[PDB]
Amino acid sequence: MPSTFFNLTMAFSLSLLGTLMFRSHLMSTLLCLEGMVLSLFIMTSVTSLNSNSMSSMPIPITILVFAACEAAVGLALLVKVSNTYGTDYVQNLNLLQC
Amino acid sequence: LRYGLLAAILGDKTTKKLHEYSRVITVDGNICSGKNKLAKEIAQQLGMKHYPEAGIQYSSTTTGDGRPLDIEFSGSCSLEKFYDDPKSNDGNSYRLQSWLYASRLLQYADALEHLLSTGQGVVLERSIYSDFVFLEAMYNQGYIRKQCVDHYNEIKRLTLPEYLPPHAVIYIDVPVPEVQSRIQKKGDPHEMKVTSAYLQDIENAYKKTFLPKMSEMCEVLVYDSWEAEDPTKVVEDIEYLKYNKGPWLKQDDWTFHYLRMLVQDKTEVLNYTTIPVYLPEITIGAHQGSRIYNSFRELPGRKYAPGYNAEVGDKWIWLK
Amino acid sequence: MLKIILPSLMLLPLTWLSSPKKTWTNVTSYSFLISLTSLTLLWQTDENYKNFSNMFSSDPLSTPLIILTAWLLPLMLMASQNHLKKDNNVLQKLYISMLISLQILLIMTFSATELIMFYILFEATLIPTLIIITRWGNQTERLNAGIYFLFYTLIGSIPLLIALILIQNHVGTLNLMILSFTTHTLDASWSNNLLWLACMMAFLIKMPLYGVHLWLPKAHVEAPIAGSMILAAILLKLGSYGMIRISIILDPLTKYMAYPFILLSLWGMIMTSSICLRQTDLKSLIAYSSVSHMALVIASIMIQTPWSFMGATMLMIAHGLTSSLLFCLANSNYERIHSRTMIMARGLQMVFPLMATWWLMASLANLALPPSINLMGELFITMSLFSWSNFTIILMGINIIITGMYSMYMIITTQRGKLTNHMINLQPSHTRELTLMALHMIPLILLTTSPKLITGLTM
Amino acid sequence: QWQEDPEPEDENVYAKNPDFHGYDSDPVVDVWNMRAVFFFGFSIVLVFGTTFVAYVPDYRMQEWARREAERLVKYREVNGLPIMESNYFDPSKIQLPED
Amino acid sequence: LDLIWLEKTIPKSTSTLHTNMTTLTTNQKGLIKLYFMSFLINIILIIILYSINL
Amino acid sequence: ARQWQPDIEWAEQFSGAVMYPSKETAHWKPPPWNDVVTNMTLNFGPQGVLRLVLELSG
Amino acid sequence: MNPITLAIIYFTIFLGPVITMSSTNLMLMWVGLEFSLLAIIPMLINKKNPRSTEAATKYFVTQATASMIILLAIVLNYKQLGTWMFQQQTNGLILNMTLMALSMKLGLAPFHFWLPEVTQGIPLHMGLILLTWQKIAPLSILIQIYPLLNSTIILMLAITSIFMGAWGGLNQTQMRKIMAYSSIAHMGWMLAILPYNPSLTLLNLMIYIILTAPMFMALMLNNSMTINSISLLWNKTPAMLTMISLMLLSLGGLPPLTGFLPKWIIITELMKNNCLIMATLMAMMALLNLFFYTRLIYSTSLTMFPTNNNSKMMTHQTKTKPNLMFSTLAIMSTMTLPLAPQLIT
Amino acid sequence: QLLREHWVHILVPAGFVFGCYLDRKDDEKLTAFRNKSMLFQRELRPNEEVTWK
Amino acid sequence: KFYVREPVNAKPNWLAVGLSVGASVFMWIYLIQTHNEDVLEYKRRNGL
């Protein structure tokens, strides 16, 4: 369990670093966001199952539901960007600088 | 009760109060060709509210006592001075154009508010959609400059798409020599000092630019004078006119409510007409603005909000 | 002190409720009554200090400043009556309110027993001077001048606030008399040196010290007459009062931290007197004369002799009165000719004999004519400075020589000589402005007659 | 050119009101403001206040200190005491440190 | 002194310094990619200060 | 005589969104005041002697 | 929007920070944070323009990254301590990541690069909603764990927040960007006073909110997006320039306005805790903030910028727009300084 | 009608009376050392109850 | 009849006036009663 939890935290760190280093695809950014979400789900579930915390096993269900609604909101925003610009390229999102 | 979201919740639905004759009809034409009489007869025999051409003193007549104010309060622009000398160095032409566009915008807001509140249709004379015709005519005649044209286009882009286009646009096609003959027969000595080049620019701006942009989104009703000068066939066409295009079909109750708020607050209507674009034609200095604003404030009935001016007979000021 | 603060506070509803044809009359008469009421603080029949309450007090140093402010307020209204005659009623009442706010907040500032309350009222007085200069100033440089004045003063005043809070945390109450009684010596360490600089530089900016004096000439030039009065006659002396109040808890290291500021003050009054010689603007020339006089005040306060403190006090009052009179005469000439050029109006002795007489007495008070309180201040400052070091007399002599030269150069090029006959728009005199000069000059004569009132704390 | 009011010219105020006193345009407010400034400036402030200041007694106890000085000089001269002691404080009631 | 060097020394020098700093610090290109790269640098820096502070 | 008030020049130095046009920021424009058909051309056919150029909105 | 979704969206916007403040669980404070974010996003994209879409996208990705970092910290604390609350012995790395992500949510520097851009392009009332309401919940989470945080990291974040906010507000012209960097500087002040006295943090937050509300109401009176637009306010609404000047001077912290009280008591407490250099630098950057405020005052009130010709017609029209609680918040944000012992606790 | 026209002339004297009243209130508030200063510690006269009011 | 349009504040809102006046009166009476009750409670608690 400590080795696998360390691997899960490094997976979250890699997904976070991928989120922070943008590429041309906002879809890829959202996919990195759900890489973080999935890593959070596995760490929470393994922690609850290891600690036998039956009172807190609803917490993975709540993080899944809340993050899924948040990503639905983000997908709607990406749909709006793709509609206004043809593509989802993040460098098209830059006219609020001035 | 003032109109608002609470009134919309309790029930003030525009689509509920709509009927067949709840239409926006705009009559357009050249300077002197039967435009006023036809609109009056159409409104009278259709049961519609007639809005004549918004002049310089439209805001003066619609606000306060309704008497026309002084010229320095109402735009400081003279149509007679423009006719006498259109290329004057003080920028009378573009000041007159911007003031008339603001008056037309206020008139369109008033007509839209009346239609959305009472359900009665409106018949306007030469609304905001056909004032760029005068703009382009003065630009092609050299009366104004490209900076004035750009500023007018910017204001039109700021204000125009926030409202709804008219349901019907009835146009009066008329030859320039006929317009010249009617102008000579009218007898206004300033108005005979207009050029056939300017009239042809107006007519060309109409035919080349105004009629198509009405054509793909509303119903266009070009008539001659002889097709006009009898306000029965035109009303018959209005009766047998089908409105199956434009953004009026996509409007629902809450869009009507938000549009009603926009047209019922006049400050949001005239918000973008006072953008800080400093053209020397329309820029007024601090001292002249101070004097004009102050004198408008000691004008009777204009010192405080309406209903709070004791000099005009308003009562219960202390209690409200 | 409340019996002076409250009716000055109630001047504001009188201003905003008076008729537009009675506002100036009512406010001027009642502010004259405010000055008459404020004269009761001179009832000092004992060595004890007039501690009116736990928050306000009167002092032999604070009392002349309060009386001076209460006296200048009706004079301020008189000077502001003319250039606002073509102005809106609401803005006129607003300007009167701004002046009354100056007068109220300055009385509370001088009468405060707490240094933190003194600081709050310090830049609480800074705000309406900014508003007056920025709104009712004439030229286009008033905005820049307001920026310069405000930011010199605030960059000065922030380390003063930090020093005040540190002193409060170290001692416990920051009450002026408690500090004066349980004053503790300093260890002459670097922290104490920086603390001394922090609590000194705010009042040094407000004085202004030489090198940092650049906000004063442009603010005085682009300011209106009431702003010029309030600056040159109250605010510099307010910085003076701040140093006098704060210097008690700064022993012993002020005896060597006084060194750069004394040199700066002496060489700077020489420098600014030279600028007064070669200055082409009358308001600028009077402003630089004010800088030189406050440099003398710096030298006295920093050498910290009791005779020097007295000379600083009498120079505060005398220079405030004579600088206000000089700015009034300059503003009368400015309202005549619509120009500020030093050389443009020359032969005014002919057309305006009584105003030229007022010019002459104002300049004679400026150049330290005996037996005036001006010369008493400069002579006692001279005596204390020579006691501090015998070679200061050379700089004092150069300063006095150039002072006489710029005062007589003022008189010669503004009154004497041939008249500029092209200025046909020369109205003879206003009884208002002649009364303004008389009300400026008579208290100078009375304080010359009795100089014991403005001697200050030391004697 | 932007619209702007022309530069006003200051008028000869004495042309329409030869008895102008500097305070207000019409004669009545001008003369009453002049009277108010004269009566409240010189009459009941520069004279009544001057009298009050002149008749403040014993201002910071110069007169009392003079009387006490004369009394102390008389005391110390009829009893042979020094006029001023070299030490303000009595040396017996001060505990100096041992080093 | 007054019209050249004290002006060049205290106020205009302070104004020029703050103008240069505000231009340099808000010459932002407006790209969320650059902003998130900056955020990553901030994260790395704060981890470094935590590791050296302990 | 009269108090100076800002002209068109002093009013126009306050537009440009920057206050400080440098070489790396002078190309910027101020924001607008109001802060402001692709359709299917299907070819129906070999489901086959019919061609349909069919213009679809969804 | 119809009133049904208007009520639902406003109720969830209200409910998010309420759950965050009322909740004693890290999980529930988290879920309140995304109630606030998710409910406010349609309100940003309400206007349906490319600038609003840009602001909504940047705001979403920033808050999503910060919320995932917050959940990382919560899960790591849950593993390390077996509970759902940073009690006393949670890891300093976890606490620093929590502070990192809450500072990212707040928009204080060097995580401030999105706040002026998100504030731009959205309507003024949404700028007010963001810059006032969206910060109480991250401040609530920060206040709940004050003795555990790292003073060095907080002081660095705070001083650079005031530096970048002062420099930005000095730089631009746009009203929304000016208010955003003003928010960044004020959050720097609140963050700096956070580890020593959270009561003064709450006091500064309430003072900033009651100063930000009448700014945004005054901007919404004429939709003045620009320094020039608020500069011709004398022709539009001359009865407001006095309160504009007073409230902007209060935002600058000039006495005797009540906006001097938060900076004053914060400096006093910081000097009680002996961080004199930090307090001096904070006060100098506050002077820079006051400089751009004073330039704004010069533009809008003390001078009179030239006007247009249609402003005559706009003065011909009447208005009932300004609400009743504008004056109450204005007076409470200007003339409350003698009630300082009552305002502080 | 004279009281209606010249009602503005009582505000400053009313403020003066109020300021004198507040000075009197502060004076009776600061009475913790009345007849207790060692410079002025004297036995009370039978016709008086306080040294100063 | 001066204005061409009927003003919103042409007539006083009588319901608003009555509610405001009654509210101010109610808070004044409640303030006096609570102040007297607080004085009596403080004296009873401290034995005054």
Ligand SMILES: CCCCCCCCCCCCCCCCCC(=O)OC[C@H](COP(=O)([O-])OCC[N+](C)(C)C)OC(=O)CCCCCCCCCCCCCCCCC
């Ligand atoms: C208008 C003048 C502007 C320039 C001069 C400004 C003042 C210079 C002298 C004071 C230092 C700076 C202000 C500190 C205020 C508090 C002082 C104090 O309490 O000292 C004792 C304290 C020490 O406190 P202490 O006494 O407790 O020391 C500890 C002692 N033991 C351990 C024994 C108990 O000194 C400081 O803390 C000073 C640190 C200051 C660091 C920050 C300085 C920033 C820059 C300041 C100037 C910025 C504006 C000008 C920029 C250039 C413009 C052209």
Ligand SMILES: CCCCCCCCCCCCCCCCCC(=O)OC[C@H](COP(=O)(O)OCCN)OC(=O)CCCCCCCCCCCCCCCCC
């Ligand atoms: C304190 C801070 C001030 C700040 C600025 C204030 C500005 C506003 C001022 C408002 C009024 C305040 C006046 C303050 C000065 C008062 C002057 C005064 O009367 O001083 C008293 C002095 C008497 O002298 P004394 O006080 O005893 O001291 C000298 C001995 N140690 O008196 C004198 O020596 C003479 C008094 C004045 C001169 C006489 C005037 C009347 C002359 C009438 C002559 C009539 C004809 C002859 C009659 C017969 C004579 C035998």
Ligand SMILES: CCCCCCCCCCCCCCCCCC(=O)OC[C@H](COP(=O)(O)OCCN)OC(=O)CCCCCCCCCCCCCCCCC
């Ligand atoms: C002998 C003693 C020697 C020691 C003492 C020295 C200090 C004395 C007191 C300091 C006085 C500083 C005066 C600063 C204001 C004067 C400069 C000015 O007015 O700049 C104006 C300019 C903006 O001009 P603008 O209006 O945009 O355009 C011109 C016309 N439209 O403005 C700009 O371009 C930018 C202005 C920025 C704001 C300036 C005021 C605040 C300065 C804060 C300084 C903080 C220092 C510490 C920083 C942290 C440590 C590094």
Ligand SMILES: Nc1nc2c(ncn2[C@H]2C[C@H](O)[C@@H](COP(=O)(O)OP(=O)(O)OP(=O)(O)O)O2)c(=O)[nH]1
């Ligand atoms: N320059 C300019 N003149 C305008 C504008 N709108 C109207 N006018 C002029 C044209 C006419 O000379 C005058 C009156 O407008 P009309 O078009 O209604 O003319 P008239 O009433 O004589 O004829 P009618 O029978 O109504 O068509 O105002 C405008 O936008 N610009």
Ligand SMILES: [Mg+2]
């Ligand atoms: Mg017509």
